[PDB]
């Protein structure tokens, strides 16, 4: 059995407000039984303050395995319960700054939150919220490139399109792998998903914000299939500006 003051810890951390932390729950990294002891605290109840400081300590002791241990079982879905139960869909500043303290360790943050957020239950409104809180703060650059790679090789969902759209108005300095990833994104949307889907203004603005300055590793056959891209997908807001970036880009 465990030493079992965790009834008292759970009772105070249900409606914790302000102050200092129990130091067994501060040095819960350096004891070998952290998941097996939170499995008997069972904090389905939560305070948002202890969400924030607990994910601070959880970043202080998260790897791939530890991120699978705590964040991919109950805390991500607790964030999901918060967004569905918030009736005006007001995910709090508590939860947001918990995510911003959570975003630090980039070792397996992909499997930490971006792998299980494309599981189910991700609508376009939760998607633009998650892309907003991603575009707010500091990011790993090479893992942003790798993220664009795997989320573009992932199946087609408008949450993933607004995700990748925010990751491309990040205004990066693009590697060859992601430039080839975007030209096979055009090869992915063809007559692909032109007869099986139609793509309105949101998809339009996504690839227009790609073509704004994401053209500096593009040769002339790539210019040609972007030319027939806009020739196939002719909207009203394409002509002068995408012709301008076609005459603006280089090799």
């Amino acid at each position: 059995k465990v030493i079992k003051a965790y009834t008292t810890v759970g009772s105070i951390l249900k409606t914790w407000t302000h102050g200092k932390l129990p130091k067994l729950f501060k040095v819960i990294p350096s004891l070998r039984n952290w998941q097996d002891v939170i499995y008997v605290t069972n904090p389905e109840e939560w305070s948002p303050h202890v969400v924030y400081e607990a994910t601070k300590l959880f970043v202080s002791n998260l790897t791939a395995k530890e991120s699978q241990k705590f964040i991919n079982l109950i805390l991500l879905e607790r964030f999901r319960d918060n967004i569905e139960t918030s009736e005006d869909h007001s995910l709090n500043y508590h939860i947001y700054r918990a995510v911003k303290k959570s975003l630090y360790k980039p070792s397996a943050f992909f499997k930490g939150f971006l792998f299980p957020l494309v599981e189910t239950g991700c609508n376009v409104r939760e998607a633009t919220i998650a892309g907003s809180v991603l575009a707010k703060v500091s990011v790993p650059a090479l893992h942003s490139s790798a993220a664009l790679s795997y989320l573009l090789r992932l199946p087609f969902s408008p949450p993933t399109t607004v995700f990748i759209k925010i990751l491309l108005d990040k205004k990066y300095a693009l590697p060859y792998q992601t430039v080839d990833d975007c030209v096979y994104y055009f090869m992915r949307f063809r007559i692909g998903e032109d007869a099986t889907r139609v793509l309105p203004v949101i998809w339009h603005k996504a690839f227009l914000t790609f073509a704004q300055r994401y053209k500096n590793d593009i040769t002339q056959d790539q210019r040609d299939f972007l030319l027939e891209t806009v020739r196939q997908r002719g909207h009203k807001d394409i002509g002068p500006e995408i012709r301008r970036e076609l005459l603006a880009g280089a090799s």
Binding site: K1, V2, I3, A5, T8, V9, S11, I12, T15, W16, T17, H18, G19, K20, L21, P22, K23, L24, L31, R32, N33, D36, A64, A108, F110, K111, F115, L142, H143, S145, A146, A147, S149, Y150, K171, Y172, A173, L174, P175, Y176, Q177, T178, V179, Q212, R213, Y214, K215, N216, D217, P240, E241, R244, E245, G249, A250
Partner: protein, 228 residues
Amino acid sequence: KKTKAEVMKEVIAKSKFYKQERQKAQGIMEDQIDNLDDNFEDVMSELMMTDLDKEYDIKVKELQLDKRAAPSDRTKTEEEKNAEAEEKKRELEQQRLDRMNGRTHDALLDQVKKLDLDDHPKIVKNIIKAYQPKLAEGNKEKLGKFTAVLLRHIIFLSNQNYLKNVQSFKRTQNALISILKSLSEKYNRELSEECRDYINEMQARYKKNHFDALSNGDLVFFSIIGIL
């Protein structure tokens, strides 16, 4: 009674919140003082002693091996360029109207580039400028120094011997003044000190000599500060 209702209800819920926060802090303190190192009894009885992830790490390592870049910072139209150009023109013209109404250590550049005649001098200046400001992670004193050295350098160059290649002099001093103004647009606050000291020292030149300390580089000195 309305103000007493508001005051009474707020004081009641405030005392409730204070009692609850004091109880939670007391619970944290007591649970700490009975479970911090008192869990050393349970620290020994009950103990406990990736393909897609490798794909993501492979893409990360591949971008770490080879990447490329993105042109420049933005995308906008030449109509917006003309709008911002007229905006900067109108702002600076009204600001000038309102103002009217109310590497090298002064001989190291000589020792370095005292080799060729005229065309290579501007190239060596541009090479020193490419040396400093590209890798400028701390380059400010060397920066402002070689601005001052370029000013003093055209001062001790402008009237030496101009009956050798006159048109090469003319093109290299015109190019030197263009590159001086174009670099010193961002740097006024190091060049103007040196111009002030040059004023203060040519006054002392005139203080002794009746006229013949007025070297004929002072004319183009006045001309180039009237340029910048």
